Amino acid sequence: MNNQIFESVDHYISDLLGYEDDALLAATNSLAEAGSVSPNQGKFLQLLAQLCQAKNILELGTLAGYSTIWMARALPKNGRLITLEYDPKHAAVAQKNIDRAGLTSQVQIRTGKAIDILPQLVEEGAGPFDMIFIDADKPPYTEYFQWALRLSRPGTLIVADNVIRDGKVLDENSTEPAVQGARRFNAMLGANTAVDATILQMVGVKEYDGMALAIVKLE
């Protein structure tokens, strides 16, 4: 769902504050050249990483590494971003995209199911992460959140994208699994007292999106 005015204003904004280098345009083009992004949303995630003074970032859902590039660019040279990708064909393309962006040393791409890799990260002592970005399959969002908390510290920012589904999450009778998964996630966030949180309704060149932001509380 979109509106001409949200697309025209987003171009106005990216013309001022959303410059994309060759690496980011190549990452966008890499999906077609085998088989939608927002520079302003990328800049936002980067600025969130900078507000966290992030040194260690966890991403669920690499795709071709578009958001990975924006976020890892917040890192200092010894910073690290771990990104989890289900599809090995995507992970390979993301690796080429990460290398072209000059981010080989800062990014580690892991291929497999996030629900299998999350406990591995705990076992390895990979955390805690300053910022965690979730944009993967919706049904498990609630379970990914609990693992995310186990990999966090007080003040960690957890971001979970695409949680409003065009307003369908308002329908208590929905039987679409993505809508049920988002609706379950939102209800969990509403009731959760380990975090302080909101959901932003974001518009622009990407279709209308809800993005959850949660800060982990000191226990």
Place this chain on the structure above:
Amino acid sequence: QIFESVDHYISDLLGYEDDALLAATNSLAEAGMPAISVSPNQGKFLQLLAQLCQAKNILELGTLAGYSTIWMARALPKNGRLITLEYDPKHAAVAQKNIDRAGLTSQVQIRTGKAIDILPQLVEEGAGPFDMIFIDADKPPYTEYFQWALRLSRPGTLIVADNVIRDGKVLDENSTEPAVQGARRFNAMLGANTAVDATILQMVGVKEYDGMALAIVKLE
């Protein structure tokens, strides 16, 4: 309507308003003054930005009745402070009652006057630096308010400027509306300003349709 319904769904989950906030909403009508739409979800977002900054010193331009002031000051530590600037003494009196009702008297200072006069005084007084600065005052001066906000910042300061897209009218390079020219000049200034990393967030539900500028101050 979709964005309004989703905004209510979100505030029901994640934008609880206690008595102090409801009383601040109702205070403008009750003291005989004009209504101002408020947004608990925007207040929650501002609070979360203050929390992420670990803010102890906040500056606000445009107190109105203290609604955003209450949201942000609730992020502070006990010895933290929020200085808020208000043009109109009747509004400052209403905001002070609203701040007092929230139990925030010891953490908030309301200064009444023109922001463009009070800003050089905060520099002279050494009232800075602020961890977070929230600008929602008159738009024509946004660029000069920003220049003063930088003098009151340190590396890593977050500066938030509200309502910078004017329902899309900033696209009109030939507008003679002072607010729209004010917003355009401010956005252009961000695009040209090497002292900050910045974006403009386009949101709906919050104030129906809003552009919020977020800028992080760099060491120059």
